[PDB]
Write an enzyme that holds these catalytic residues in place. Structure first.
Site, mmCIF file in Angstrom:
data_model
loop_
_atom_site.group_PDB
_atom_site.id
_atom_site.type_symbol
_atom_site.label_atom_id
_atom_site.label_comp_id
_atom_site.label_asym_id
_atom_site.label_seq_id
_atom_site.Cartn_x
_atom_site.Cartn_y
_atom_site.Cartn_z
ATOM 1 N N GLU A 106 49.615 -5.256 10.785
ATOM 2 C CA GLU A 106 49.555 -6.682 10.534
ATOM 3 C C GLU A 106 49.488 -7.062 11.872
ATOM 4 O O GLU A 106 50.391 -6.587 12.777
ATOM 5 C CB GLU A 106 50.865 -6.906 10.030
ATOM 6 C CG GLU A 106 51.321 -8.193 9.971
ATOM 7 C CD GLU A 106 52.145 -8.676 11.160
ATOM 8 O OE1 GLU A 106 53.017 -7.719 11.773
ATOM 9 O OE2 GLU A 106 51.695 -9.703 11.974
ATOM 10 N N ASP A 120 53.534 -2.951 12.078
ATOM 11 C CA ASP A 120 53.962 -4.194 11.964
ATOM 12 C C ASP A 120 54.061 -5.079 13.522
ATOM 13 O O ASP A 120 54.431 -4.281 14.209
ATOM 14 C CB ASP A 120 55.232 -4.449 11.279
ATOM 15 C CG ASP A 120 56.398 -4.173 12.097
ATOM 16 O OD1 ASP A 120 56.553 -3.011 12.730
ATOM 17 O OD2 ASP A 120 57.034 -5.152 12.495
#
Length: 587
Positions: free
Chosen positions: A317, A278
């Site tokens: 991400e 992330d």
């Protein structure tokens, strides 16, 4: 063994010729005296002094009668003369709140990847992810206590299975100190959070998920450096793991070995099938601005974590539009198999919020995703990040009155499951929770109590979407190949109707039609590619799911009537605020 430091570092059971105990190992090169404190030593660093090794800056000392279960820590004097206590960064199970102490224990045996688990990760497989935060999916009735790994194994796994999801994605199970960080602010990268039981209880949970046919994706946070309990900062007295808020020193060999090794640990020691990074943007920036060191770490992690355990995959991400995020290193960089399509989520959510009547002027929010679908291997996501801090639940973003709100939601879900890209959906969305996600409570399963309501119908649709999505290769075989998608009607802006076809390698296609206004469309004609008989296989307007039950009744045959530059067309009823999928019937 640089790839697998965790196999020698930390605390492991040994035998000095007939004498058994556990061997310790810590990498605090500078330090200046480091001793083993713990239940065994009556907690006295003044009893078991470790013997350094400049060749590798690694300290070590074997201790007989030092068996698993025993708590412990490290005693050292900073390279600057400061006395401190350190929790073994390679703790495989840790004692968080209680003064922070590591736990002696082995390495989980070792999980071999099955041919099936590998195939589920492939680009041509249907991949539908159920994202969960273990400390808030479900809570015990009165206690309001957390379910354990064992209980979650008994309940979350079967549930995920029944609902049709192919993968289970867990927000960081890293041992971390604060519930509210959701696990993205760790203190123990090698130890499964103790909130739900033992590291073996956790191992069991993954095993259970596999026995149920589910791949597990674990949120991996190699981009979040420990900022709590002086867990990793200024180890050995100096900036050991970080650079001179705080950020890792990926350049530093051992530091990279620690991270890359940790990704190998989870996959081999626990059987994890995929790791998800992330905020890769915050890693690659803050090259002019590019932290060329981190960008090099990720590429290598994926290169190694591609040679060492083929079958496992990585997803990321990335906020900005860094090029090639999910592209080969020997070209673009990073090299993640998949990337989160945040842009698609922003476009489609921005569209669903719109007043049905204004959607004719933002038709481009649903057609755009296609222009760049071939730049990355995407995962269309509706995650936990979008239903907190005032963003609301997905349901609450929908406009109109009750019926309209759910119908919009279902129509959207219908569009999502048919659009190019794998799928990810956070817990609670499947049954249209109204409230935002609260990591401190259970998931409002109360809405699904007594009497079939709209929430039951939405949950019923999600499952149907999953099972229809899988099964029909057309909906998941060529997500990344332009041959798998083609518009039938991309410009009916005035009526907010969009139709397209999905196609598998065999050339079989499935028609996808969405009506985004509450106006029912009858005798709606559009060109098709494969004439013959067509039947609905999915209709979000079904009385099931609580729709108005409008649609085409079992089998509509095409006509040789030119439409949309095509010879042959269908002419169907497009239910209000809904999407349908049709398949051709062989004769």
């Amino acid at each position: 063994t640089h790839l697998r430091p965790y196999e020698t570092l930390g605390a492991h059971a040994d035998t000095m010729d007939g004498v058994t105990g556990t061997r310790f190992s810590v990498w605090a090169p500078n330090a200046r005296r480091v001793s083993v404190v713990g239940q065994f030593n009556y907690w006295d660093g003044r009893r078991h002094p470790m013997r350094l090794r400049k060749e590798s800056g690694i300290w070590e000392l074997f201790i007989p009668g030092a068996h698993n279960g025993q708590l412990y820590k490290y005693e050292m004097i900073d390279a600057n003369g400061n006395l401190r206590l350190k929790s073994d960064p390679y703790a495989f199970e840790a004692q968080m709140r209680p003064e922070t102490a590591s736990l002696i224990c082995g390495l989980p045996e070792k999980v071999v990847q099955t041919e099936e688990r590998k195939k589920a990760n492939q680009f041509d497989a249907p991949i539908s992810i159920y994202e969960v935060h273990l400390g808030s999916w479900r809570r015990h009735t009165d206690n309001n206590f957390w379910l354990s790994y064992r209980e979650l194994a008994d309940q979350l796994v079967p549930y995920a299975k029944w609902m049709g999801f192919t993968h289970l994605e867990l927000l960081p199970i890293n041992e971390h100190p604060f519930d509210g960080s959701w696990g993205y602010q760790p203190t123990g990268l090698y130890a499964p959070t103790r909130r739900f039981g033992t590291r073996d209880d956790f191992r069991y949970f993954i095993d259970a998920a596999h026995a149920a046919g589910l791949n597990v994706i674990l949120d991996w946070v190699p981009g979040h450096f420990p900022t709590d309990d002086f867990a990793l900062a200024e180890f050995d007295g100096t900036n050991l793991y970080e650079h001179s808020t705080l950020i890792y020193n990926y350049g530093r060999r051992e530091v990279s070995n620690f991270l890359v090794g940790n990704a190998l640990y989870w996959i081999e020691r626990f059987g994890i099938d995929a790791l998800r990074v992330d905020a890769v943007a915050s890693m690659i920036y803050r090259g002019g601005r590019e932290n060329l060191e981190a960008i090099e770490f990720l590429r290598n992690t994926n290169r190694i974590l591609g040679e060492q355990v083929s079958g496992a995959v990585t997803m990321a991400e990335e906020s900005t539009d860094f090029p090639g995020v999910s592209r080969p290193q020997d070209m673009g960089g990073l090299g993640f198999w998949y990337k989160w399509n945040l842009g698609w989520m922003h476009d489609t959510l921005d569209y669903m919020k719109l007043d049905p009547v204004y959607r004719q002027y933002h038709h481009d929010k649903l057609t755009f995703g296609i222009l760049y679908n071939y730049t990355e291997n995407f995962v269309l996501p509706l995650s936990h990040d979008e239903v907190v801090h005032g963003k609301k639940s997905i349901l609450d973003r929908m406009p109109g009155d009750a019926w309209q709100k759910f119908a919009n939601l279902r129509a959207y879900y219908g569009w999502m499951w048919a659009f190019p890209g794998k799928k990810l959906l956070f817990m609670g969305n499947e049954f249209a929770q109204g409230r935002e996600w609260n990591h401190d409570a259970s998931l409002d399963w109360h809405l699904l109590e007594g009497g079939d309501n709209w929430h039951h119908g939405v949950q019923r649709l999600v499952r149907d979407l999953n099972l229809t999505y899988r099964h029909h290769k057309a909906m998941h075989e060529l997500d990344f190949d332009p041959y798998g998608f083609e518009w039938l009607v991309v410009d009916d802006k005035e009526r907010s109707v969009l139709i397209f076809v999905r196609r598998d390698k065999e050339g079989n296609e499935i028609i996808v039609a969405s009506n985004f206004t509450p106006v029912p469309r009858h005798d709606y004609r559009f060109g098709i590619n494969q004439p013959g008989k067509w039947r609905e296989i999915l209709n979000t307007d079904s009385m099931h799911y609580h729709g108005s039950n409008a649609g085409n009744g079992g089998t509509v045959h095409s006509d040789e009537i030119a439409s949309h530059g095509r010879q042959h067309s269908l002419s169907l009823t497009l239910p209000p605020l809904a999407t349908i999928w049709l398949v051709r019937e062989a004769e």
